[PDB]
Amino acid sequence: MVFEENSDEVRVITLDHPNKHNPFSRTLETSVKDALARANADDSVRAVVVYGGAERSFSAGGDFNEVKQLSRSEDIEEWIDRVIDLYQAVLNVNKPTIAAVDGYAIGMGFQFALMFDQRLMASTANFVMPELKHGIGCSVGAAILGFTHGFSTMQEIIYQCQSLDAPRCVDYRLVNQVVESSALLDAAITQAHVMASYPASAFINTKRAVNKPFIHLLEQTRDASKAVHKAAFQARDA
Template sequence: MESAISDVSPTLTIEIAARAALVEFSRAHRQNPFSQARMRELGGILRALDANDDVGCIVLTGGNGRSFSAGGDFHEVSTFTGGDEVNNWIDDITNLYTTIAGISKPVVAAIDGYAIGLGLQIALCCDYRVGSDACQLVMPELRMGIACNFGGFMLEKIVGRSVMQAMLFTAEGWNAQRALEDRLLHEVAPASKLVSRALEQARKIGSWTSQAVQGTRPNINAAF
């Protein structure tokens, strides 16, 4: 079965084919920042795809020629006037991470351009990360005066304490080769082949026995 869903959101589109669902962050802004509404939309889409029997694996991408995500929409954050708004924003971030890590179907991140802060953390919640040869992965929160507890926890689980400390405290960008060497990425592909390579992996994963995959993922992510 093949389908394309373009009216779910003006900033998120979905295509389903060969048991792989491609979710594209299609915001007009090329760096794909995430507003609260967009976080909620993505969470809802992921839950719907998790319940769709035609889907065995999900790919997240920023779209052709776009960054995966430059992180949170700080223009939106700058309009907050009180603690309740900040707390709601943090709750939306936490809920999105929990959704990505908690659904039963594996998620592949196809990362081009920048994956910064919240954008990188979304990718870290995924099971498999393919980066383009031009990607840059950055965790700049401390440089910006923002605590980075979620990011630090995720990084330590995935790449270990030493790399986590280097990323957080230097706030430097990791290029594709360095990210591959430090296990932030599972593989690197040319930008022109990034999405096709991610879909290739997703279709392979989606072909496995669904009961085995969906019985495994929640358990291995429980501590994450």
Template sequence: MSYKNILEEIDDNILTITINRPKKLNALNRETIQELHDALKEAKSDDEVKVVILTGSGEKAFVAGADISEFADYSPKEGKGLAADGQKKLFDYVANFPKPVIAAINGFALGGGLELALAAHFRVASDNAKMGLPEVSLGVIPGYGGTQRLPQLVGKGRAMEMIMTAGMIDANQALQYNLVNHVVELGDLLEFTEDIAAKIMKNSMVAISGAIKAINANYDDGVNGFETEINEFGRAFGTEDFKEGTTAFLNKRKADFPNK
């Protein structure tokens, strides 16, 4: 499929989706959110895709925020609809995606850009990255999951401070806060992230999908994460991957998972 605002590349079962609006520092507008949804929906059913990497074009920005010009004159009802639609189409969709999604943060990840990175299953940052949720400086709050996902990663106090001050933190501070898993030089960012993806793909993708579901359940209000884990654990016993993994272990060889 051809897109206006994003680029796609599949190599060795890794789909790299690059947000490509360099003149706008890759800011998210409604069209880009829809394109990202469409690309991910296609990747979900594509057996060739095992891991997704999200990144931004250029060296300045992952995503520098939402495109404010689109909603500056919105009413309260329109603002609520904007947040609900965006969360459903992209941010919640990424968080609950059945295949691993890694954010490779190259440069600024602000507002909706940081919220997109937060929705990914984990994050790798370049050493020039800067992250923040500056929405209160515009008289609004994070609306794409930032008030929920940031505290889960960095703790309530740090999330409160970041959101209230509208300030930015650098990559090393983000690492200290557990907001990102790794910090690497900008030129090594994609290769490093691809290496992690390659390690992931040595394992059962069916089991990984179950693990994503179980881990996420712990953060869903009213959902018993332990119960979800038990169910996913039991479901794994009926997969071809379980048969191959246990057989390979008992025969002291490497598993060759069919991912079924």
């Protein structure tokens, strides 16, 4: 559910769900996590680009209907572990990571992108965190955005549930660059080359130090998120 390509020392991972919006099914998560782990352990790889593919979305995220229909506390927990594991997978890559966002980055797709060292988007792309509008809890998205972009920006995004176009994303500093769709993947590879040229040792050590509090935050969020659901289903199942 991904393909792996190389621009010399740059590994390009293209998401290839049968659906062109790259919804994070279990299978797609696993393929991504596995590809990232291979990139990280492959010495020939010095930087990594993740891309939804041409005329596809970065990720429409997880199925909101599926999450609302989950019948057990444990179902939602295993799902929260999946979500947090996906993001930790990205944070634990000690080489430069670049997200090339086209189409939609929704929910998990938006959170996923925030794990990358740098983000570029197409001028025609959109970021969305619409969980609350759709009756989905947004505590994971909130914790992540509040860590990455601060409290007030997080509140605005999560409570307005708007589609954030390129100019809006520039304004929020959610992305580092905006380019045309047709130029995006190349622009991302280029930035990946630039960061791959940074001496690896100093980069690895720095990124580790940088990402450590983020990783810690996500682990706290893993634990904290399960808790309200344990109590909800304890009541119902009585």
